[PDB]
Amino acid sequence: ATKLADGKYNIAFTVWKGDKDESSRMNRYFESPATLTVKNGKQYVSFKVKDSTSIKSFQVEKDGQFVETTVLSENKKDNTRVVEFEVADLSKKLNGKVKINIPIINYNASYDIRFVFDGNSIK
Ligand code: HEM
């Protein structure tokens, strides 16, 4: 009654900071709306990642464990990539962590972020 039947959908997301509720800078890197692919009731979120060379790690939590996202495809001419992960409950705010490395300025950082999916946006 409540599930999404198998299919390739769209869903809008916004990225929030790890411990604060504020738009996250990742909103200018992670592109919405994400693609949403359903197979056997396995909900898969996938989207484009720009400036992909500086986002050298991107993980979201899976079953208590922060797990590194699955790159589906890359574009080296763009300096972007396409990543995928599963989200079982899209109501809950998805936890994620990104490591940002910008070698020339010696910027090496690791941040907490969270994804907020808009259910009413599915199509
Ligand atoms: C691809 C390039 C960059 C990305 C993706 C990035 C991303 C982020 C993220 C996600 C955060 C914390 C979470 C948030 O604000 O939503 C953050 C914090 C911050 N960033 Fe960057 N950043 C980049 C480059 C830079 C550069 C070049 C500087 C300065 C030269 C900078 C200065 C800062 C500062 C001062 C903070 C606050 C740190 C704290 O209070 O803990 N960022 N960045």
Residue numbers in the entry: 30 to 152
The article reads:
B. anthracis, a Gram-positive pathogen that is a potential weapon for bioterrorism, secretes two hemophores (IsdX1 and IsdX2), that acquire heme from hemoglobin and promote bacterial growth in low-iron environments. The NEAT domain of IsdX1 is the only known NEAT domain to bind both heme and hemoglobin, as well as acquire heme from hemoglobin, thus making IsdX1 a useful model protein to study the relationship of these processes to one another. The structure consists of an immunoglobulin-like fold with eight β-strands arranged in two antiparallel β-sheets of a β-sandwich. The heme-binding pocket is enclosed primarily by a 310-helix (residues Arg-54 to Tyr-58) on one side of the heme and a long β-hairpin (β7–β8) on the other.
The heme bound form of IsdX1 was solved to 2.15 Å by molecular replacement using the structure of apo-IsdX1 as the search model. Heme-iron coordination is achieved through Tyr-136, which is conserved among all heme-binding NEAT domain proteins. The distance between the iron atom and the tyrosine oxygen ligand is 2.3 Å, which is typical for an Fe-O bond of NEAT domains. The coordination bond to iron is stabilized by the conserved residue Tyr-140, which forms a hydrogen bond with the phenolate oxygen of Tyr-136. The aromatic ring of Tyr-140 further stabilizes the pyrrole ring through π-stacking. The least solvent exposed heme propionate forms a hydrogen bond with the hydroxyl group of Ser-53, as well as the backbone nitrogen of Arg-54. Additionally, the side chain NH1 group of Arg-54 from chain A also hydrogen bonds to the least solvent exposed heme propionate, and also to the hydroxyl group of Ser-53. To accommodate the heme molecule, there is a shift in the residue sidechains of Arg-54 (2.5–2.8 Å), Arg-57 (7.3 Å), Tyr-58 (2.1 Å), Tyr-136 (1.6 Å) and Tyr-140 (2.6 Å), away from the center of the heme binding pocket. Met-55 in the holo structure has its side chain pointing into the interior of the protein and makes hydrophobic contacts with the heme pyrrole ring. Two heme molecules from adjacent subunits planar stack upon one another (inter-iron distance of 5.7 Å) and the crystallographic interface is further stabilized by two hydrogen-bonds; one from the NH2 group of Arg-54 from Chain A to the most solvent exposed heme propionate from Chain B and the second from the NH1 group from Arg-57 from Chain B to the hydroxyl group of Asn-135 on the adjacent molecule.
